Design an enzyme around this catalytic site. Structure first.
Site, PDB file in Angstrom:
ATOM      1  N   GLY A  25       2.783  -3.889   5.446  1.00 26.07           N
ATOM      2  CA  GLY A  25       2.393  -2.790   6.353  1.00 26.07           C
ATOM      3  C   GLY A  25       1.529  -1.723   5.691  1.00 26.07           C
ATOM      4  O   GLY A  25       0.841  -2.027   4.688  1.00 26.07           O
TER       5      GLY A  25
ATOM      6  N   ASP B 294       9.961  -5.832  -9.276  1.00 33.28           N
ATOM      7  CA  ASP B 294       8.492  -5.645  -9.320  1.00 33.28           C
ATOM      8  C   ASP B 294       8.171  -4.272  -9.887  1.00 33.28           C
ATOM      9  O   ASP B 294       7.263  -3.605  -9.387  1.00 33.28           O
ATOM     10  CB  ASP B 294       7.861  -5.836  -7.931  1.00 33.28           C
ATOM     11  CG  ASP B 294       6.382  -6.248  -7.940  1.00 33.28           C
ATOM     12  OD1 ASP B 294       5.857  -6.765  -8.994  1.00 33.28           O
ATOM     13  OD2 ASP B 294       5.726  -6.018  -6.896  1.00 33.28           O
TER      14      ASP B 294
END
Ligand SMILES: CN(C)c1ncnc2nc[nH]c12
Ligand SMILES: [Cl-]
Length: 260
Positions: A19, A120
């Site tokens: 998004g 991450d």
């Protein structure tokens, strides 16, 4: 200008796969937050986000569904990312790197303590507030590795190749915590050298072979002072069971060195 209930969406802070993130300003009260817009894995993300309560982790304010758009309301970091503080081929002043590393460890100890792995860690996911406090952001890959005090091994490969630990490329199953520790070591390299050491920690990568053969007269290592470099020798250890733990990082000489 678009809006959500009481908030105005006034500019794009980030455009990722997952998004867009917008600056949201309550037109009444003037409070500025960040809003992740997902055009609907997100059940899980929101569950992890609601667990998060620490000064070096992005706070979750709540969400709204409006048709096929989920809105996730989160703490705003107005200082941008650690990525923008890293000068290519230079890095940053050692004292600033040390302070950011201290904050990154506080954030990662926190997550590991509630049994969450981020998976991450990299400078784009480390945001800065108005006072240059570090906030670990983006829980879209995050997962539970400890529940009811029992560890589960991970087997999903994910992350960003230059930041991933070698066990993630080589093992069917691996421990979560040493993978996050490794990626913090690559972040520390990037802060002190303004360059990533290798494309990926594989045997077919010459730069990774060079580090395993201790050729620290090569870049990026020759730009790094002996003290932080001795910590990088303990973090970037191929065997995840021999790799330093965060309790032992906290006893490292450079970690505890008073700096400008
Ligand atoms: C770029 N980006 C993702 C963001 N920028 C500013 N504040 C944020 N809070 C969560 N994500 C944020
Ligand atoms: Cl870099």
């Amino acid at each position: 200008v678009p809006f959500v209930e009481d908030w105005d969406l006034v500019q794009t802070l980030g455009e990722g796969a997952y998004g867009e993130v917008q600056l949201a300003v309550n037109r009444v009260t003037e409070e500025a937050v960040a809003v992740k817009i997902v055009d609907m894995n997100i059940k899980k993300e929101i569950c992890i986000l609601k667990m998060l309560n620490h000064e070096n982790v992005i706070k979750f304010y709540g969400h709204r569904r409006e048709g096929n758009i989920q809105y996730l309301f989160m703490e705003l970091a107005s200082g941008g990312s650690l990525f923008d503080r890293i000068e290519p081929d230079i890095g940053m002043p050692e004292p600033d790197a040390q302070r950011f590393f201290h904050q990154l460890m506080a954030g990662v100890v926190y997550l590991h303590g509630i049994g969450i792995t981020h998976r991450d860690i990299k400078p784009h996911n480390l945001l800065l507030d108005e006072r240059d406090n570090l906030k670990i952001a983006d829980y879209s890959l995050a997962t539970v590795f400890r529940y009811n005090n029992r560890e589960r091994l991970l087997n999903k490969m994910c992350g960003t190749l230059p930041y991933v630990a070698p066990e993630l490329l080589k093992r069917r199953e691996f421990h979560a915590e040493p993978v996050d520790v490794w990626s913090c070591g690559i972040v520390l390299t990037a802060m002190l050298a303004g360059e990533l050491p290798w494309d990926q920690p594989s045997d077919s990568c010459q730069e990774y072979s060079d580090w395993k053969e201790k050729k620290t007269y090569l870049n990026p290592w020759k730009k790094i002072d002996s003290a932080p470099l001795a910590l990088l020798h303990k973090i970037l250890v191929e065997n995840p069971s021999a790799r330093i733990t965060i309790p032992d990082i906290k006893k490292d000489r450079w970690y505890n060195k008073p700096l400008k």
